[PDB]
Copies of this chain bind each other. A is one copy, B any other.
Amino acid sequence: DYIQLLSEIAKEQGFNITYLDIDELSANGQYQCLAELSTSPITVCHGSGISCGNAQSDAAHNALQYLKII
């Protein structure tokens, strides 16, 4: 998965990623995921969670894609 790609780079660069599902109201299922970058400034990326683990992939893909564009 995309998370595996970031994790490999994280250990080499000494980075840390915090993935969390739903803000707090998981009972109603928001169908979204949120990731927070601990090493760099606090940045929050949103996941879609349209599939089994699409949310995690969308957040990692968005970060990697964003870095490429800049």
A residues with CB within 8 A of B = 20, 22-25, 30, 32, 34, 41-48, 58-59, 62-63, 65-66, 68-69
- Select one of B22, B23, B44 contacting A45, CB under 8 A: B44
CB-CB < 8 A to A62: which residues of B?
A: 32, 44, 46, 48
Q: How far is the CA of A18 from the CA of B23 in the complex (A)?
A: 22
Task: Give this chain's copy count.
Answer: 2
Find the B residue at minimum CB distance from A58. Answer: B46
| A24/B69 in contact, CB under 8 A | yes
Q: Report B-chain residues with C-beta under 8 Å of the C-beta of A34.
A: 65-66, 69
The interface residues of chain B lying within 8 Å CB-to-CB of A41 are 41-44
